[PDB]
Write a protein that binds this ligand. Structure first.
Ligand SMILES: CC(=O)c1cccc(Oc2ncccn2)c1
Length: 100
């Protein structure tokens, strides 16, 4: 769980992290509520991590991947949020696998 802190810290402070720092506001984003069944973001993962809610590295990575799955589900690959999400998804997968 120490690497979960390191990678979440580094994801939070990443340049392309801006679309995933706080939860998507469905009032502002038209169609998000309907399309994304299980929304997830870095503050929600932060909140759960500081509360000790993650039992293992697998549960953490599950929510991490859910962010980028939702991103790709809702956003086009060439959109501004999508382009950012690919940078974060690749960053996460890369860092995650050099420690595991
Ligand atoms: C993540 C995602 O799919 C999305 C979708 C639309 C807008 C958007 O912007 C935004 N959300 C939250 C915080 C800052 N920015 C993000």
């Amino acid at each position: 769980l120490t690497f979960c802190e390191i990678i979440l810290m580094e994801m939070e402070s990443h340049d392309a992290a801006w679309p995933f720092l706080e939860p998507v506001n469905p009032r502002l984003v038209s169609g998000y509520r309907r399309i994304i069944k299980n929304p997830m973001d870095f503050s929600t993962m932060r909140e759960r991590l500081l509360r000790g809610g993650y039992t293992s590295s697998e549960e953490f990575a599950a929510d991490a991947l859910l962010v980028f799955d939702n991103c790709q589900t809702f956003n086009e690959d060439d959109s501004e949020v999508g382009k950012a999400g690919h940078i974060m998804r690749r960053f996460f997968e890369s860092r995650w696998e050099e420690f595991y």
